[PDB]
Amino acid sequence: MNTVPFTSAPIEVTIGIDQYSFNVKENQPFHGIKDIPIGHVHVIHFQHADNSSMRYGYWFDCRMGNFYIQYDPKDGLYKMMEERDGAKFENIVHNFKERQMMVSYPKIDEDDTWYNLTEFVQMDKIRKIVRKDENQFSYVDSSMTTVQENELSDPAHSLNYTVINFKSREAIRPGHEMEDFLDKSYYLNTVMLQGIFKNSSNYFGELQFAFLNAMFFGNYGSSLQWHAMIELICSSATVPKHMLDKLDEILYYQIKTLPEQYSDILLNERVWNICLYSSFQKNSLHNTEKIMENKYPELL
Template sequence: MDPQHGGSANSSTSSSSESVRPLPSIDISPPPRLRPHQQASADSPSLNSLKSVDSVPVTGIYPLGSLRINEPTDNEDVDMDLATPLTVPDTTPERTMDKNLELLKGGDVLLLDDLPSSFTVGCDTISFSTTQQFLGFRDIPPGAHLIWVAPSESTSSRSGYWITTPTKEETSPGKVYVKQWDKFNEVLSDPASQAEERFQRERLGEIFANLAPYQFKASTSAVSPPSRSGNAEPLPPFVNNTTIWHQLTSSIQSHLLNRVLGGNEETWPVNTTDRIVGETTMPEEARLYPSAAAQFQFSFPMDQRLFDTTAEGSERTQQALDPTTWTLARTDDGKTLLGEIQFAFLTGMHLGNYSCLQQWWYYLVHIVFRSYRLAIERPELALDLVQTFHAQLVYNDRYLEGDIMESMPGEARRLQKALTVYKSRLNEQLLSLGDRCTAEQNAVGQAFSALESWLWRFGWDLRGEYVRSGKVMLEDGEMVEAELSDFESEDERGEFAAVVVDVDENGRPTDLVSV
């Protein structure tokens, strides 16, 4: 019988050994091994399909392709049965590190990983829109710097980081900071893992030429927009285009950022939705920004009285009218107050953080320009405060879109009143000193005069020539008696003013009516 039709191959020998039947042969050889260079059969998945996204199940919190395989650093024997052996680059970690150190001699580097194209990027005094993936900045000089990003220029939410670069010797290399765009939360954050951060640092030599220098001026940059002031007079030296950022950040140090933002880090995240600790959030805002967390902790809370609660009598009244003593008691050398004013202004203006802007107004209206004796007792600190406020106004006018005075008119009106009183008190104190007025104290008066000249462009007259009571003509021509309450604290009719009464020989008030 044909073996192909079920017949036995040993039927011809069955007569000689009918009692013994051969056992069926069993093939126990291993299946053929599919090597990388062999052709796969039609029934098995092809090599191309194994690389397909659709055929590879992925689990985890990181997107496919974001994880990378690092080569082993030791001399282990790796058993890989490949047709073509791997080629190892002729480099060592030590040589890569030495090359990176050479690149960092120009300053610090900040790398932005996974930042999409068409983003708005800002670094200190510059901001620009990207047309392709932006990799970061290089040659960052010593000082405090604010780097932020936003999906577009019209986006209301921005995310950034403060970094502080210490002054180094000429031979000392800079540092490399790595930040990654979190697509899920839409914020700038630290890298997802230490391996990812190390990978970005090691590829510095490959991308260094594509990093933007710190002095980068893009064609689409918002640097030096047309000034609203028109033909303005020349600026003082401390607010020119070269030194203005240093004037704005001179007291922002790492220890101040650690205290205001918490923690002990090398970089400090800030966002548009950050709030001050203890600040009440509206329910609508809580639903809109569920992840917003209160983190700012300023040294001078807005809900705190500006005097010592244990003080009594005239001392309590004096502290309430002039919080100089209270202010100096809460700051070591004055740098705390100055640094927080600088931080609140820049974070509020660049990121649109409303809490920081409110804190900035509070500092100016209730502390800086109400501490009248500061110009006499601590003229160096008073000079720094006046010049910093002047620099902030110039920066707003020349580098930022929008006017902080127009955006918050109620606060601007209160500030104008505070400055009017401050000018009057400052002139009185300096004139009373006469020949005893020091150069530092006189410098405060000159700095305030320069500030007063700048404020004329807002139509602010700080000469203090105002009438507290008198006749006022209404729109229809009628004359009425009126009394202005704008400066009622100046004639000691405030909340903490002492009440003067006449008493008789027994110490009893004589103006009381008795029956």
């Protein structure tokens, strides 16, 4: 069970750790988050009480180093940093624990929600989508644009999601225009799975990461990416049976976790109606169709 200590909390802020969140008051003696489950990526995220604009946060994996948070009064944000001195870090954590100035990652034993949302998400893949190679953790915020959004302006601060475009030479074989447009199986299976992602696990990892960035930061480009990766599978007549069954579980937990009040901005009506009711895979997403119909029947 790992710990992310906080130097201090000088400004009032809502702190998120994965799907949980805590209000911290200005100068409250808060010194971090303990009992973080090993084996998963995690995201620690912030919304300042005085500017509910710019949700921002850090993807990390405690197996890769000792990370802490420290407020920077110049840049005006909570920053993640790595402590390279193991003994200094262990000594900081032990002191804060002894003084019980740390919140406990509040995982219910029965609850597989975080595993289910992050099943295919790997830190090494996050670090290729979010490029800052001198850090082992990855900064994301509400405003960061995707490589695809930038094509249609600071490259160093971009989300490098795989570009998916249904009306591109990449998506459409010369002489198979109608076939490839109406059945995207060659784009999914040859170009994306065999070509770029190498396997379904990496494809699902990027899909899951795009969703979580959409949900936790309201990142619009991430939402676009999540919907495009769903639509590419649903619009393919030929998908491996294991991928469809796994997609149904992935989407079920995403729809289950989504705040009820954010369905309006985070869910694309056209994509969901097409995927559940018109697409080749309209009958392959039983769990997802049941939770969507019971939770968001307005959208459909």
